[PDB]
């Protein structure tokens, strides 16, 4: 039984990007998935994506061009403070120049850099680079 | 897949996207509800009422001609059954299996199926208890079969 729509969507998009496909459809749609894809688009990693509506659950098609090594998920949603952000990002990212970590926050679902800028923490969602 | 059998299947209904009554259907809501009341008085269950309405009367399903579902309408008028249809069917199947088992004591497969059916009955009765439709003291008992026909 599907326990996490986000994990399946991330695994599917990772497989599609690794194979070399140009676009992939995700069967389950949720708001957090839309926010995370929007984070990717704002950071400039994926292209235009099309949410398709039905009366049961939406579907999402993503324009993957060339810029994803992989993009994944951490479960469960571990809670992280500001002092623990550095420890997570040293052993979670390939380097310090690029790569981002997203985490849910009451001020908005944003990356680690914006969370540090606004001086807030929350629950970690995943990473992409 | 299936809850008990190890088989995987994919066969069920597929409702259309357009949520609007078709224009060729001249039937209103009041006459559809009247037909539903007549079929309920005849002695049927909501499982077959929708089938009869979608076969003979040509209506796709109730949830578009009216707002309330079939069971909702039956509850509204008050002649809805006191016990859910699926639980009744499971109880009847369990009684049939036990009646078959009383004489033939060597049918091990029947015993296994009876155990599985009682498990299903317990799992559904727990949900009915936690959704506030049956009394908290309601219990499924092996010997109690004549009253729960």
């Amino acid at each position: 039984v599907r326990m996490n729509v986000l994990a399946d969507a991330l695994k599917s998009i990772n497989n599609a990007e690794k194979r070399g496909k140009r676009q992939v459809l995700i069967r389950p749609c949720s708001k957090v998935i839309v926010r995370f894809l929007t984070v990717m688009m704002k950071h400039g990693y994926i292209g235009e994506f099309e949410i398709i509506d039905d009366h049961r659950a939406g579907k999402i098609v993503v324009n993957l061009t060339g810029r994803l090594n992989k993009c994944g998920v951490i479960s469960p949603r571990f809670d992280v403070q500001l002092k623990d952000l550095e420890k997570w990002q040293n052993n979670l990212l390939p380097s310090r120049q690029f790569g981002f970590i997203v985490l849910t926050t009451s001020a908005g679902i944003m990356d680690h850099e914006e969370a540090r800028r606004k001086h807030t923490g929350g629950k970690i969602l995943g990473f992409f680079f | 897949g299936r809850m008990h059998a190890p088989g995987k299947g994919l066969s069920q209904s597929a409702l259309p996207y357009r949520r609007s009554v078709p224009t060729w259907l001249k039937l209103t809501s009041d006459d559809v509800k009247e037909q539903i009341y007549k079929l309920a008085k005849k002695g049927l269950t909501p499982s077959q009422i929708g089938v009869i309405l979608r076969d003979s009367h040509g209506v796709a399903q109730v949830r578009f001609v009216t707002g309330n579902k079939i069971l909702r309408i039956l509850k509204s008028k008050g002649l809805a059954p006191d016990l859910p249809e699926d639980l009744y069917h499971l109880i009847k199947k369990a009684v049939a299996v036990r009646k078959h088992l009383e004489r033939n004591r060597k049918d091990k497969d029947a015993k296994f199926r009876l155990i599985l059916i009682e498990s299903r009955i317990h799992r559904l009765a727990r949900y009915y208890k936690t959704k506030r439709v049956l009394p908290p003291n309601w219990k499924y008992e092996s010997s109690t079969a004549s009253a729960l026909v």
Binding site: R22, Q23, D54 | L10, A14, L15, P16, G58
Partner: protein, 83 residues
């Protein structure tokens, strides 16, 4: 393969796939308007009726329950009604 168009698939591709695997879930069933030369009143039936139906006017048995569609009685005309 690599560069398809899943947003705008051709109708042939969409009809090839299963009803629940299409870009949007749409049943492949439909309703009918069956009538016979004997009686002169027209009824509405479902393709997969799965239930014996008597014409209103006690003419004859119209449909037959099978695994898929319904075996229409010989000497009957039907049209696909749609909106």
């Amino acid at each position: 393969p690599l560069a398809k168009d899943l947003l705008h698939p051709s109708p042939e591709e969409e009809k090839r796939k299963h009803k629940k695997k299409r870009l949007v879930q749409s049943p492949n069933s439909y309703f009918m308007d069956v009538k016979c030369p004997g009686c002169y009143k027209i009824t509405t039936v479902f393709s997969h009726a799965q239930t014996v139906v008597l014409c209103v006017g006690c003419s004859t048995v119209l449909c037959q329950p099978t695994g898929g569609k319904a075996r229409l009685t010989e000497g009957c005309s039907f049209r696909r009604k749609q909106h």
